[PDB]
């Protein structure tokens, strides 16, 4: 999955710069970037 890239992408598009918060949101979406983004 390359979670580093997924995290980078999520932060770039959502503006959520807090890493812990970003990871929590990604985990709640099973690291599915598409779902996490359209969830903000």
Are 3 and 27 in contact by the 8 Å Cβ rule? The answer is: no
Experimental method: X-ray
32 dihedral zone (left: phi>0; alpha: psi -120 to 50; beta): beta
CA-closest candidate to residue 40, choices 6, 15, 8, 23: 15
C-alpha span between 2 and 18 (Å, rounded): 19
Neighbours of 26 (CB within 10 A): 23
Which has the closest alpha carbon to 2: 35, 37, 26? 26
Q: Is 6 helix (H, G, I), strand (E, B) or coil?
A: helix
CATH number of 1-40: 1.10.8.10
For the chain, the domains span 1-40
Experimental resolution (Å): 1.7
Alpha carbons 31 and 22: distance in angstroms, whole number = 10
């Amino acid at each position: 999955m390359d979670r580093e890239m997924i995290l980078a992408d999520f932060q770039a598009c959502t503006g959520i710069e807090n890493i812990d918060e970003a990871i929590t949101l990604l985990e709640q979406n099973n690291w599915d970037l598409v779902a996490a983004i359209n969830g903000v």
